[PDB]
């Protein structure tokens, strides 16, 4: 990155953070023109720049050399014995669209002495999607109810040239849609999971005006303000859960791995509140709740797809996403 | 064997160095002295004299009237063979007689080098003042135009004093600071520092050169900083650093010649480094540079058997000078 956890910054330096500055300053690399830092030199702005994603794919490939160095998972590594994913379906069509969102610009302008504010807003078009629900039918033949981790990914079927991808060529392209822990009772049952409840996403932030109104209303009148209804600001926006897709529709693989929740949460508390964004943003003030490597079970090479196909607790199905312009 | 006689002996040995000696006593010694005749005059009982005499008798030494470079490995080895003999002499008559004998047998550039470092590094040399090399070998300090006027003055048998101008033209901004690197005394400072602190020194020659590797850093740091102060004085920016993968912006025409060997070569402006046959590939320089920086950023130098030598300590800079020179 590097962080202050680095055991040897004198030798390994700070590749990623220095790269942000190297890239950000390429419009004036010698300071001759006195230009200010580039968009890459703030986390507020870095993703606006196309080169952000070229830099971060470069960095991602460094990590991938390490993750690719481990032996592929075996059947015995992956099997959650007695747990079979019988079916994966979605209740509701997968549909994206653009809608409009407003935020205040008042703090950007200069207010005089004794000059009344006027409302000044920006309106942006933003991606969004319709609500849907996963229906994951699972057969538990273990003999007792068991905690399971449900890991949900969206994977490309073909590339932009129309070439069908192998699982090994898909896995590093898959995007995480959800991760959750749920007790699966003995027998056959359908788990339902709302798109709204994804542990990858958080809702749009409340506006500054709304926070002022709610705080002021609570303070005025001796009313206990409680905002325990809102989430953290870390997390993919809920509205961006799905890729845009195409008006003609595109098909993707919806990949579901159901894994041993006891093993995954050992040393923690599996059936406890982990907040709404633990997949990539963790749990405020607590240990990370999932012991598996990030990306499990897609983070190692899969040279032989037969291994995955032979594991009853892994299943993928084809889903279609349609963009409404 | 007194200082007056030793100084006179050195004066005579260095006089008209491109011709056979004109002093009857030195001619007699060169004719009749046997470097192997009485090994009791050496601290090594003649070992070094045997090595040099064998090379001489096998016709393996560089001819007289030929360019000499201390950076040429074999020519340096030959000069150091004579240094080794002089350095083993217990008394002055050994030093003088061997110098006179090999003056008439060995290349003049090798001989002058060996005699200077022999005087400097032998206690027998104490109290001797070496003549300035710009009067012993003026070609190495005097542009070709002035030497030609000297050659003309000699061809015509007429005395004269001839003005030396700096190299280049007024269109060449680098000429503004030619008075620094072309100063004959600055050149003597530089050659003499390396004669005092030679990279070929081994303590088997008799003593240790204290802190040599750190003094190597320091003397060149001061040359660099002093040159930049002249640039600043002449409305020039500081020098850039060289890099093996970038052009050397500033070329150079010395307008100087060897006494034997021809004109010194010129370098055009704005050239990329090319591999030099028999020396190194440009890529080898980059690798060597990388390895040195690896030691610096590790905080240790790696020994031949792989064990670490800590440089996070006051002698680290000295060890770096040892490995960098
Ligand atoms: C050489 O320089 C001296 C003084 O530096 C001057 O008197 C003389 O005119 C110069 N000679 C020529 C040929 O320019
Ligand atoms: Cl059911
Ligand atoms: Cu980054
Ligand atoms: Cu030097
Ligand atoms: Mg030759
Ligand atoms: O980033
Ligand atoms: O980052």
Is residue B84 within 8 Å of B115, Cβ to Cβ? no
All residues at 6 or more sequence positions from A55 whose CB lies less than 8 Å from its CB, including other chains: A19, A20, A23, A40
Cα-Cα end-to-end distance for chain B: 37
Q: Phi and psi of A68, rounded to 5°?
A: -75, -15
Q: How many CB atoms lie within 10 A of CB B269?
A: 11
A43 alpha carbon to ligand 6 midpoint, in Å? 6
Closest A-chain CA to B294: A11
Residues in B lying within 8 Å of A, measured between beta carbons: 297-299
- Report the DSSP beta bridge partners of residue A254: A154, A317
Q: Which of A95, A256, A87 is nearest to A174 (CA)?
A: A256
Q: Which of A317, A324, A300, A323 is nearest to A157 (CA)?
A: A317
Cα dist from B271 to A184, A302, B175, B245, B249, whole Å:
73, 50, 19, 11, 7
Is residue B281 within 8 Å of B275, Cβ to Cβ? yes
Q: Which of B133, B93, B127 is nearest to B113 (CA)?
A: B133
Tokens 């598996």 identify what position?
A: A292
Extract the tokens encoding B100: 């006179």
Q: How many CB atoms lie within 10 A of CB B19?
A: 10
Ligand with an atom nearest the CA of residue A87: 2
Is residue A234 within 8 Å of A281, Cβ to Cβ? yes
Measured CA to CA, the distance from residue B319 to residue B314 in angstroms comes to 10
Cα dist from B6 to B74, B117, B127, B154, whole Å:
30, 15, 9, 30
The conformation of residue A222, written as its DSSP 8-state character, comes to T
For residue B297, the chain A residues in CB contact (below 8 A) are: 10-11
Measured CA to CA, the distance from residue A221 to residue A78 in angstroms comes to 57
A279 alpha carbon to ligand 6 midpoint, in Å? 18
Counted residue by residue, chain B has a size of 325
Is residue B84 within 8 Å of B54, Cβ to Cβ? no
Ligand with an atom nearest the CA of residue A191: 2
Angle at B301 between CA B297 and CA B306, to 5 degrees: 120
Cα dist from B69 to A263, B197, B264, whole Å:
73, 17, 12
Domain ranges of chain B: 1-166, 167-325
When scoring A7, A10, A15 by the number of chain B Cβ atoms within 10 A, the one with the most, hence best to mutate, is A10
In Å, how far from its chain's centre is CA B4? 26
Measured CA to CA, the distance from residue B310 to residue B301 in angstroms comes to 7
In Å, how far from its chain's centre is CA B134? 13
**Helix H or strand E encompassing A256:** strand A250-260
When scoring B237, B238, B292, B297 by the number of chain A Cβ atoms within 10 A, the one with the most, hence best to mutate, is B297
Distance from CA of B297 to the nearest CA of A (A): 5
Tokens 């600001």 identify what position?
A: A233
Angle between helices B24-32 and B3-14 (to 10 degrees): 80
Angle at A88 between CA A84 and CA A91, to 5 degrees: 145
Is residue A16 within 8 Å of A59, Cβ to Cβ? yes
Reduced to 3 states (helix: H, G, I; strand: E, B; else coil), residue B42 is strand
With b meaning 16 or more CB within 10 Å and e meaning fewer, what string describes B235-256? eeeeeeeeeeeeebeeebeebb
**Domain B167-325, second-level architecture:** Orthogonal Bundle (1.10)
Give the CATH number of domain A70-99+127-204+224-325; options: 2.60.40.1520, 3.30.70.260, 1.10.10.350, 2.30.30.30.
2.60.40.1520
Is residue B122 within 8 Å of B87, Cβ to Cβ? yes
Measured CA to CA, the distance from residue B295 to residue B311 in angstroms comes to 8
Closest A-chain CA to B298: A11
Alpha helices by DSSP H, listed for A25-141, are 51-67, 75-78
Extract the tokens encoding B78: 């030959």
Resolution limit, Å? 1.6
Extract the tokens encoding B146: 């002035």
Q: How many CB pairs under 8 A join A and B?
A: 4
Angle at B164 between CA B162 and CA B170, to 5 degrees: 140
B79 alpha carbon to ligand 5 midpoint, in Å? 17
The conformation of residue B251, written as its DSSP 8-state character, comes to -
Q: How many CB atoms lie within 10 A of CB B18?
A: 11
Measured CA to CA, the distance from residue B211 to residue B194 in angstroms comes to 14
Distance from CA of B226 to the nearest CA of A (A): 25
Annotation says A1 is catalytic = yes
For residue A30, the chain B residues in CB contact (below 8 A) are: none
Extract the tokens encoding B113: 């080098």
Q: Phi and psi of A156, rounded to 5°?
A: -70, 145
Angle at B133 between CA B130 and CA B134, to 5 degrees: 135
Closest B-chain CA to A12: B297
Extract the tokens encoding A253: 């693989």
Measured CA to CA, the distance from residue A243 to residue A154 in angstroms comes to 9
B289 alpha carbon to ligand 7 midpoint, in Å? 31
Is residue A153 within 8 Å of A296, Cβ to Cβ? no
DSSP B154-218: HHTT-----PPPPSS-TT-GGGGGHHHHT-HHHHHHHHHHHHHS-TT--GGGSS--TTHHHHHHH
For residue A10, the chain B residues in CB contact (below 8 A) are: 297, 299
Dihedral class, residue A267 (left if φ above 0, else alpha if ψ from -120 to 50, else beta):
left
Q: Which of B64, B246, B90, B256 is nearest to B166 (CA)?
A: B256
Active-site hit among A1, A213, A251, A266: A1
Distance from CA of A7 to the nearest CA of B (A): 12
HSE at residue B112, side-chain half, CA atoms within 13 A, is 27
- Return the residues preceding each gap in chain B, C–N over 2.5 A, or none: none
B261 alpha carbon to ligand 5 midpoint, in Å? 8
Distance from CA of B268 to the nearest CA of A (A): 27
What is the SS3 assignment for A151-177? EEEEEECECCCCCECCHHHHHCCCEEE
For residue B299, the chain A residues in CB contact (below 8 A) are: 10
């Amino acid at each position: 990155e590097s962080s202050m956890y680095s055991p040897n910054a004198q030798y390994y330096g700070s590749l990623h953070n220095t790269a942000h500055v190297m890239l950000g300053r390429q419009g004036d690399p010698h300071g001759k023109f006195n230009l200010p830092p580039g968009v890459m030199e703030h986390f507020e702005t870095a993703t606006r720049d196309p080169s952000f994603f070229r830099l971060h794919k470069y960095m991602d490939n460094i990590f991938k050399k390490h993750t690719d160095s481990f032996p592929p998972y075996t059947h015995d590594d992956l099997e959650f014995a007695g747990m079979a994913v019988d079916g994966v379906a979605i209740d509701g069509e997968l549909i994206t669209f653009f809608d409009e969102f407003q935020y205040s610009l008042i703090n950007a302008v200069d207010s005089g002495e004794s000059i009344e504010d006027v409302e000044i807003n920006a309106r942006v078009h933003r991606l969004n999607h319709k609500e849907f629900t996963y229906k994951i039918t699972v057969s538990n033949s273990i003999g007792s109810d068991h905690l399971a981790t449900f890991r949900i990914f969206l994977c490309p079927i073909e590339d932009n040239n129309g070439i069908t991808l192998t699982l090994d060529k898909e896995r590093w392209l898959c995007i995480e849609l959800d991760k959750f822990f749920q007790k699966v009772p003995s027998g056959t049952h359908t788990i339902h999971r709302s798109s709204k409840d994804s542990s990858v996403t958080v809702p749009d932030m409340p506006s500054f005006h709304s926070l002022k109104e709610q705080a002021d209303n609570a303070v005025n009148g001796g009313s206990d303000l409680d905002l325990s209804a809102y989430e953290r600001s870390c997390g993919i926006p809920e509205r961006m859960l799905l890729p845009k897709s195409k008006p003609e529709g595109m098909e993707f693989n919806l990949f579901v791995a159901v894994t041993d929740g006891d093993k995954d949460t050992e040393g923690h508390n599996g059936d406890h509140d982990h907040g709404g964004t633990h997949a990539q943003c963790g749990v405020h003030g607590e240990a990370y709740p999932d012991n598996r490597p990030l990306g499990y079970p897609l983070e190692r090479r899969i040279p032989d797809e037969r291994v995955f196909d032979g594991v009853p607790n892994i299943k993928h199905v084809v889903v279609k996403i349609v963009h409404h312009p | 064997s007194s200082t007056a006689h030793k100084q006179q002996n050195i004066n005579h040995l260095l006089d008209k160095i491109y011709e056979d000696t004109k002093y009857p006593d030195l001619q007699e010694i060169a004719k009749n002295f046997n470097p192997l005749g009485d090994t009791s005059m050496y601290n090594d009982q003649g070992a070094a004299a045997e090595v040099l005499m064998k090379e001489l008798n096998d016709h393996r030494l560089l001819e007289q009237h030929h360019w000499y470079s201390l950076f040429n490995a074999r020519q340096r080895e030959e000069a150091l063979m004579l240094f080794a003999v002089l350095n083993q002499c217990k008394v002055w008559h050994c030093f003088r007689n061997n110098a006179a004998y090999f003056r008439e047998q060995m290349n003049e550039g090798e001989f002058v080098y060996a005699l200077y470092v022999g005087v400097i590094h032998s206690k027998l040399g104490d109290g001797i003042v070496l003549p300035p090399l710009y009067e012993i070998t003026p070609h190495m300090f005097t542009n070709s135009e002035v030497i030609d006027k000297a050659y003309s003055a000699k061809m015509t048998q007429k005395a004269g004093t001839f003005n030396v101008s700096f190299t280049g033209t007024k269109k060449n901004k680098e000429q503004r600071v030619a008075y620094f690197g072309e100063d004959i005394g600055m050149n003597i400072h530089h050659v003499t520092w390396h004669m005092d602190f030679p990279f070929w020194w081994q303590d088997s020659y008799g003593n240790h050169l204290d802190r040599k590797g750190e003094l190597f850093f320091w003397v060149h740091h001061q040359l660099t900083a002093r040159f930049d102060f002249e640039r600043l004085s002449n409305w020039l920016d500081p020098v850039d650093e060289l890099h093996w993968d970038r052009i050397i912006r500033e070329g150079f025409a010395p307008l100087t010649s060897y006494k034997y060997g021809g004109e010194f070569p010129v370098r055009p402006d704005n050239i990329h480094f090319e591999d030099v046959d028999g020396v190194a590939h440009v890529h080898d320089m980059e690798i060597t540079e990388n390895r040195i920086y690896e030691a610096i950023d590790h905080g240790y130098i790696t020994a031949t058997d792989g064990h670490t030598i800590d440089i996070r300590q006051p002698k680290g800079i000295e060890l770096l000078g040892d490995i960098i020179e």
